[PDB]
Amino acid sequence: GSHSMRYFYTSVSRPGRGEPRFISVGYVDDTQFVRFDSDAASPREEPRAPWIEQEGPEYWDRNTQIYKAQAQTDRESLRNLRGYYNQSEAGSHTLQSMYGCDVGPDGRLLRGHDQYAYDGKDYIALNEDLRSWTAADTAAQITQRKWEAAREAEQRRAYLEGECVEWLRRYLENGKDKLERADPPKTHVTHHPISDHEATLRCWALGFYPAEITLTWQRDGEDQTQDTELVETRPAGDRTFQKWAAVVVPSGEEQRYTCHVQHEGLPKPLTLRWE
């Protein structure tokens, strides 16, 4: 299948309380596989999926030193950004980093990503050409000129075309079925009378992977878009996801309603009813 790897960094300043907190998480598709927290008793990269545990001690040692260095770099970036924006040295600010690679079924790079947000606003991003930057404002143009002079885009491109693609391929070979084969939803319909005249039909999708899914209610095979309550897809906590869709219907008309489930893990789209 097509796959992605992403690293997500969050640095949060706390002036007067010490160095910023740095947290990193790594994902392959929708599976978190590593974390690092600068505030841990002994900070180090830690496994968060079983298939990464087989990586040897040199892996964990290299990555731990990288996060420690990146925490110090983000601390410098936070100091520079509050200077660029002429902000108070007393206040807490956020620097977020998001990078990684999208690959096709043959494992070739489809797209590289390397971008940043300051206090929840887009700041600077490596363009799809992996050679040029988009800066949000004159502060980000200071960073852009610094990074153009330092040939940062070249160093980012080398990672995204090399280590990112090559390590994602390795994780997929080690992850095997956990990463390659979708886990279809377990589905059921529940019925909740509101009154003698109205009832709720709720269509459940549980334990599915990956998170992408479509749930629709139909009346006589027509989508009930404007009348469906749909909850945001949510983690079960065991690496699988949940979703439900609900419709309020006239009591005794339940038989006209079908729930339609589309998920990559299903042999074919499911039609469910209250039964």
Binding site: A69, E76, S77, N80, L95, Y99, Y116, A150, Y159, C164
Partner: peptide, 9 residues
């Protein structure tokens, strides 16, 4: 595996 850090902003 993560990218080696490079220059500050």
């Amino acid at each position: 595996e993560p990218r080696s850090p490079s220059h500050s902003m």
